[PDB]
Amino acid sequence: EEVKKAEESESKSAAKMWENMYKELDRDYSLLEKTVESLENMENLDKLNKENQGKLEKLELDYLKKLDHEHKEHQKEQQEQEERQKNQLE
Amino acid sequence: SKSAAKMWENMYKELDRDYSLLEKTVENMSLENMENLDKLNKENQGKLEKLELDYLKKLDHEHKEHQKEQQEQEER
Amino acid sequence: LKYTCLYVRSTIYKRCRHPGELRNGQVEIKTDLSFGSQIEFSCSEGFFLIGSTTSRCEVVGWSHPLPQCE
Ligand SMILES: [Ca+2]
Ligand SMILES: [Ca+2]
Ligand SMILES: [Ca+2]
Ligand SMILES: [Ca+2]
Ligand SMILES: [Ca+2]
């Protein structure tokens, strides 16, 4: 007879249990629902592509400057050797 | 009360299962983004090497051109 | 073809927060707390319900707030 009072007491405390841990997980689930969106990854890949392209452009310009610098000194050295054979006075 | 306890148990068990699905969804998305960034840097480093290879090959070609230039000037 | 969620989901239903506890009343959950579901409100004996009788998880949040009993 007293069992029925124990079943309703256990069911009431169980109902207040599964509801309470739902409230805690429902608050944590909202933090997981927000961190899903996506934009942080799209912006991370876009930010790395800009820095990587700034490296390819600064290196290519530096190599193009050195290649143009070499050709300038070669054209000037050949013009100096020409002015030397002209002076070489006999 | 028994029906109330079973409802909140079934609603938590679904909240717990969906939480694990969202956790694995963000874990796989975070790992795929790291793999995409690794391929971006690996594809990059291959382009830096191509710039250095072309720079050295052109600089080496210019040295050989100046050798054939003087040899052609001495003969002429 | 790359699609997008209209709902929340790496290649399901969105969920509304807990509705709270209705003082001197009862909050009946018909299905779950997800998008599209609805809840019902009732007041105790001798209490008039001041506000909405139902509320739906609309596009997410509850369409109607918590009613009042007296
Ligand atoms: Ca993420
Ligand atoms: Ca380099
Ligand atoms: Ca030639
Ligand atoms: Ca409740
Ligand atoms: Ca009444």
Author numbering:
A (entry chain B): 42 to 78, 81 to 131, 134 to 135
B (entry chain A): 52 to 127
C (entry chain C): 29 to 34, 37 to 39, 42 to 43, 61 to 108, 113 to 123
Question: What text appears in the publication on this structure?
Answer:
Antigenically sequence variable M proteins of the major bacterial pathogen Streptococcus pyogenes (Strep A) are responsible for recruiting human C4b-binding protein (C4BP) to the bacterial surface, which enables Strep A to evade destruction by the immune system. M proteins form parallel, dimeric α-helical coiled coils which are attached to the bacterial cell wall and extend ∼500 Å into the extracellular space. The most sequence divergent portion of M proteins, the hypervariable region (HVR), is responsible for binding C4BP. We identified C4BP-binding in several M proteins that lack an M2 or M22 pattern, and determined the structures of two, M68 and M87 protein HVRs, in complex with C4BPα1-2.
The structure of the complex between M68N100 and C4BPα1-2 was determined to 2.5 Å resolution limit by multiwavelength anomalous dispersion phasing using selenomethionine (SeMet)-labeled M68N100. The architecture of the complex differed substantially from that of M87 protein and those observed previously. M68N100 formed an α-helical dimer but not a coiled coil. The two M68 helices were asymmetrically disposed and mostly parallel to one other, except for the very N-terminal segment (aa 42–77), where one of the helices wrapped around the other. About two heptads of this N-terminal segment (aa 58–70) bound C4BP. Only a single C4BPα1-2 molecule was evident, and in this molecule the C4BPα1 domain was largely disordered. The C4BPα2 quadrilateral contacted M68 protein, although with some variations. The C4BPα2 quadrilateral hydrophobic pocket (ΦHis 67), instead of contacting a single hydrophobic M protein amino acid, contacted a cluster: M68 Met 58, Trp 59, and Met 62 from one helix and Tyr 63, along with the alkyl chain of K64, from the second. Valine substitution of M68 W59 or Y63 reduced C4BP binding ∼50-fold relative to WT M68 protein. In contrast, the M68 HVR utilized the C4BPα2 quadrilateral, albeit using multiple amino acids rather than a single one to contact the ΦHis 67 site, but lacked contact to the C4BPα1 Arg39 nook, with the C4BPα1 domain in this complex almost entirely disordered.
